[PDB]
């Protein structure tokens, strides 16, 4: 129960709009249960933590590193209920991008092992 809701990684990033393709600052949190949740403002209490702006599930996701429109961009391709979606993120260094993509992959891998077991 409690290990599943551990926060694996959290931090600020920029998230690109889907239609108005600007880079928007968002605070994201990844948990062991595959939830990847974003906030406009970094939450400062539990009520704020419980009301994210963005909410994705990283189970079986694909993780793509790209250099356009900016270096150090990454794309997650994931399933949102029954629709495949892509979301685009940016951080300031390739090392930080690797930290995020590896963290997400590690969580996805743990979920697949749970399924197998």
Ligand X SMILES: O=P(O)(O)O[C@H]1[C@H](O)[C@@H](OP(=O)(O)O)[C@H](OP(=O)(O)O)[C@@H](OP(=O)(O)O)[C@H]1O
Q: Which residues bind ligand X (CB under 6 A)?
A: 15, 17-20, 24, 26, 53-54, 87
- Record the tokens describing residue 72, joined without a space: 């150090």
**Helix H or strand E segment including 12:** strand 7-16
Is 20 labelled a binding residue?
Answer: yes
Q: How many of the other CB atoms lie within 10 Å of CB of 9?
A: 16
Single out the residue of 45, 53, 46, 97 nearest to residue 71, CA to CA. 97
In the complex, what is the shortest distance from the CB of residue 75 to ligand X, in angstroms, rounded to a whole number? 12
Q: Which residue's Cβ lies closest to ligand X?
A: 17
In the complex, what is the shortest distance from the CB of residue 56 to ligand X, in angstroms, rounded to a whole number? 8
Of the pair 5, 85, the CB lying nearest ligand X is at 85
Is 69 labelled a binding residue?
Answer: no
Pair 48, 39: CB distance under 8 Å: yes
Sequence ranges of the binding site = 15-20, 24-26, 54, 87
């Amino acid at each position: 129960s409690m290990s599943d809701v551990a926060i694996v990684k959290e931090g600020w990033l920029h998230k690109r709009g889907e239609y108005i393709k600007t880079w928007r600052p968002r605070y994201f949190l990844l948990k062991n249960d595959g939830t990847f949740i974003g906030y406009k403002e970094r939450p400062q209490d539990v009520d704020q933590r419980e009301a994210p702006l963005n909410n994705f599930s990283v189970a079986q996701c694909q993780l793509m590193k790209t250099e356009r429109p900016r270096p150090n961009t990454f794309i997650i391709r994931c399933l949102q209920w029954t629709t495949v979606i892509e979301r685009t993120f940016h951080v300031e260094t390739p090392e930080e991008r690797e930290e995020w993509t590896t963290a997400i992959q590690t969580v996805a891998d743990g979920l697949k092992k749970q399924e197998e077991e």
